[model samples]
Target: LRYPPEMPGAEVKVYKKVDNVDLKLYIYKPADWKPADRRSAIVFFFGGGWQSGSPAQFRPQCEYFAGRGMVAMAADYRVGSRHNVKVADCVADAKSAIRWVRQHAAELGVDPQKIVASGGSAGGHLAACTVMVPDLEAPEEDHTISSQANAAILFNPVLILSREGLLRERLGTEPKAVSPYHHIRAGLPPMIIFHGTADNTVPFETIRLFAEAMKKAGNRCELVPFEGAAHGFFNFGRGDNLAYQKTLELADEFLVEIGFLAPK
Candidate 1:
């Protein structure tokens, strides 16, 4: 299930099929492998408030994971910015991408069982949704592709938007359909969430409250807080970038802990 021979090119294939909008992701790779030595994979969803954001914005982080010997991909899903895409549509895209990646795992140089999903903000919500909500699927296709993952790496993720006065300003009724916190159940992927204490976008307390709920539901939930960091601080460049580096490092550790990456 690995990629084709021409996958070395820097071009990312975009698929807009009638079934579902396709987004082929491309990023760097380690130096020691060939067609026989594929690595684990990470599906990265970029944050843009569920409205807008391009996969290119997450290139640095994708390349960073690739450099660490993991196949990283940045995927694009439906958004609310254009065409009035609803939250359910975005959730559909997320679910479909995970299914696609797993179905084509060997071709994409990824271990199907070792796939890990990570994202920020709305993207984080999508990643969590893919992990938590196990029943989201369109009725028009083969729905056997397992969209579940080994673990999740969330950075300032918005888990509970269904709460009043949260994302209601922007989401309104749409949030009811896609909020991850509302859909969390007993058996979920191991999750590591990093949120900033000063984040006003997703709110610090809400994140903690969601983690508590997950724990009470018998799920593994780890919370890491960045002091004085804001909502989008992980996207900022270096020059006082401890938070960003810490996030990357923490994610790497989490991936390794969950057996997504081999020990050095």
Candidate 2:
């Protein structure tokens, strides 16, 4: 809600502003930082099964990356309806949020050339769509920022959205309306997918299939399976939550691998 001064050893501030009607974004910046001329920025989207979620859910992650000297953002977007939130509206919001972030990258301390889309669940679909669905219309008229993300970080992403997948079962929607698999493209950003072997919400087999598709397209993609973890395991903080820890670690590593951070 408000921006704080530099945090001494940690230089990060939270900047917030409304991006659209009832839609807003929180831009997180590290102190004494400049946008990378060539590397990518990290833009995080929150998940709520395409119904309910907010930018606040990713504040800790924003802080984590800001502390690491990366430009991070968590933005609000539309969601599906239990009865009213249509899939089209939610997908539109997703595309809009990406455009908003890109349009304001300069003011947000983001490297305009390097914007990475990252999120979980339905949010992941949004992130993936930001890159894969190249034909989707831009959210606003800024015309300064590019809507396409250069890379993606997907945590337990609902990549398929088929009638057989858990997402369709809960939302009671046909695969064509919400499925990312049906819209895959060859030029999507490098993807890092995390899923669980026992995930009932989004099956591991789906990840496998998606990975194969990405590979066939000659896109850079990797899938990290969490052995026996279940859906939403990344959100919990239990002591033995390896999946949660692994998710963070994978993100850190991916950032480093993609030249966002120095290897530590």
Candidate 3:
């Protein structure tokens, strides 16, 4: 993490501490939000292949959601460079961040049952794991509070962690132990995925397999593709921002369909 990272108009709060590192949630709340009201909230995790990233990665997004009357945030978690942790630890941290928000709902002015998880690339993988992967958690966190999300939003997430694949060594455990594609089942939360058809990292084919599995299990999953955009194409300010705008438009419609946000 860089010193004095610049994130304007955010209210930062420490969500958890592991190995003496204080993980935070850089939050953006609707101007009309009140502590007594339970508004919908979304937490975003940054993508860096579980090695490096910044909450700033989702600044434009957090700001956008807040504009739409939802409380939004970008969460911080340990990475290989800063904490030398394994990919499993990254999964645990994501769940913890969600659990923390639900546990602190009263003060945060968020609906405990309407929270959403979102991210891009590796962070997107962590977001997917929050719903699909089970029995995974931080060593010192309270388990009684559920870490499950009511819905998920992803961008170019890696669903396969094949033992022989490039991520095997970094997993620090059997690939199946954390792979979301292998854990699909009915009654899971609705999910929306945005991907670039030409993405080399976490390719479009990977996302199709995930969506197919979700449907096979009778879960609702939607995939929106950007014909030739590459990985991270949905990010704001990336190449004309057309895909970014379109993806968010679809996201807003999805959220409204799920009753997380009222349509304009």
Residue pairs clashing in model 3 are none
For model 3, state the Cα shift of residue 219 in Å: 0.7
For residues 39-156, what per-residue lDDT tens digits would candidate 2 score against the true structure?
3467777777787766665566777777777777776665544335555456666666677666667766666656788888878888887878544453444545566787888878
Q: What local lDDT does model 3 show for residue 260?
A: 97
What is the C-alpha lDDT profile of model 1 across 1-264, one tens digit per residue? 112223343447452243444555664556674545558878888788788877765677887888889877777776767545666666777777777778777766777887778888988888888898646565554687787776888988878866644435545345556678777678787989998899987889988988998998899899998888788888747437777788888888888887778766
Q: Using lDDT as the measure, name the better of candidate 2 and candidate 3.
A: 3
Number of the top-ranking candidate, with lDDT as the measure:
3
The list of candidate 3 runs beyond 4 A from truth reads 1-4, 163-166
Which sections of candidate 2 miss by over 4 Å? 1-20, 34-39, 81-84, 138-145, 163-174, 236-241
- Write model 3 residue lDDT over 57-92, tens digit each, in one string: 888889999999999999988888778888999999
- Candidate 1 weakest ten by summed lDDT: 1-10
Cα-based lDDT for every prediction: 0.74, 0.68, 0.89
